[model samples]
Target: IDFSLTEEQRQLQALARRFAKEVILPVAQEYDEKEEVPWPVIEKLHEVGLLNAIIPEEYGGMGLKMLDEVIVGEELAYACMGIYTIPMASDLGITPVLLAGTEEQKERFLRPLTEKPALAAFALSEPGNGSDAAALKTRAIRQGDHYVLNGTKMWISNGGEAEWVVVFATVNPELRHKGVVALVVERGTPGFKAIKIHGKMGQRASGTYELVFEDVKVPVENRLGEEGEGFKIAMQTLNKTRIPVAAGSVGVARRALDEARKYAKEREAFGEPIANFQAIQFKLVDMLIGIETARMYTYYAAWLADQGLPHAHASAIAKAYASEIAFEAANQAIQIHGGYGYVREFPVEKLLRDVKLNQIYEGTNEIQRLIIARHILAA
Candidate 1:
């Protein structure tokens, strides 16, 4: 397995890093403190061609390969994982459609995103069910050329501000995952409402929200793929998306290590630099080891995605292991900072907070274990 990035991939990473340092890093702390979604930063992401990196050229997108996206995600996330979450979730929202939607559906719903950079959201987890998506209780019944939707989705990223949403609801509650269907719902439909959910512990700038649908009418034409394909579609989307989420975690780990290394060199404890202390040096070494291993595994998962091989197992392993290791690395970095790390005044505290969410979102680390176990059992 060649572990090298191609020239084109290297260039993409460089561009992402430049944008992240110049635009995102400067404002991340402010946005985090204020709990504000930085729309201007999103616009800059679009200008830099990072917003719709995975959408195909045929559909008015830059059409980056999965590995390319992983590279870009790591670089941008190194600047600010919270800001990167916006584009990351937007990409997650639309990837299912790109993978499963009819050609007409892609043209009608996805083309606009490429023409002008706009946010899109995916609505899946309901008030009643989150990780238990198979138990989704939302209903969509066919009504003469349309589907009437009624349900509440909680913790929807970009919910209130998105131009459109990919909604997954069950047509038959008794059938569990098989009963679910995926549909595209544009913002401002007759009965769709979104309220922002704030005060998140981490990734506060990502704009999480609660979305409600009451008799929302969606054209039958908006249905993605076949009826009852939602579970498969959602799973396929995760197979691709989870790897980048791991990449984001690795980015946070890399930043924490950098900060810890710098602090250890300059900060003196017991009349000597902390870097000379074996305890501090050991933690730094562990952080470095975790970050390097996680990054390599994430890249390998991306490579598998690019090869069109079965990536579910690899993605699960990468996301689960990287998320846990990254969190450990961040925590260790904060510990190395001593008391100052616990305060918001220091960036390591923020990095620790930011890295915690990676363990929760994009399929919790527990879910990753289950996925990996199933893959192994099947093999």
Candidate 2:
């Protein structure tokens, strides 16, 4: 099987890398420190057509393939994970609609994104339910032509800024997963409020928010798919989004390794560059190994998705493995920087902070392990 990127893919990667290094890298730390979403930078992403790159061409988007999306994700993430997450999660937020929305729904909801640089939110987790999305407490009851929605979603990425939200609520709370239903909730649709949550450990630039729906009115036409299919739909959406997350982690790891290697070559200890020491050499070598392995798996998973094959297991493995290894690589890169790494003056410390969230979000590494275990046993 061919593994190399097509000429178009290569060009896409190169352009993304250049844009990321030029635009994102310089402002990442400022945004992270302030815990603010950089609208200017976000607009720049839109200008480059990077904000919603995965929406289909029919919907007036680039219609990027899975592999192409992963490549761009890696490059943008290499610039800064916290900054990258803003657009990254937006892409995730839009995936379900792209995958499952009816043509009419796409025109009404997805069309706005193409008309202008609009943001979208994905709402699945509640205060009580995270991994247990099936146990979600949010309720949406049918009321003639509309559904009255009542529930709260926490830690929603792009929550405050999104013009629209893809929400998963239960039509029958007693039925658990089977009761789940996906619906699109437009911003300012009476009783819908998005509140910003601040002071995150990392990924502060992304600005997570909490959404509360109090008897919110949603039209019947806003329903994403048939009732009781929400759980399955959410899973399918994740299957595609997870690959980009994995690729982003790999990019972060690569940046950390590059920084560590550069530092090792110049920083001297005992009257010689640290590069001369076997200890430093070994650390750099291990970093490279981890990055290379994670990247290989990430690319394979992306390829599988592109081919329309069964890739859930591969996506889980790649995302889990790459996130963990990316953290390791960042930590080691910091260790190599010695005390300098811990200081904010250097990028390694920031890199370390940024990479930590990758392990926790997008189905935590622990969740990924469960998925992989089940797949292996089932196989």
In terms of lDDT, the poorest run of 10 residues in model 1 is: 108-117
Per-residue alpha-carbon lDDT of model 2 for 189-211, expressed as tens digits?
88999899988877788979999
lDDT of 2 at 331: 89
Q: Which TM-score value belongs to model 1? A: 0.98
Estimate the TM-score of every prediction. Answer: 0.98, 0.98
lDDT of 2 at 119: 87
lDDT of each: 0.88, 0.88
Instruction: List the lowest-lDDT window of 10 residues for candidate 2.
Output: 109-118
Candidate 2 residue runs with Cα over 4 Å from true position: none
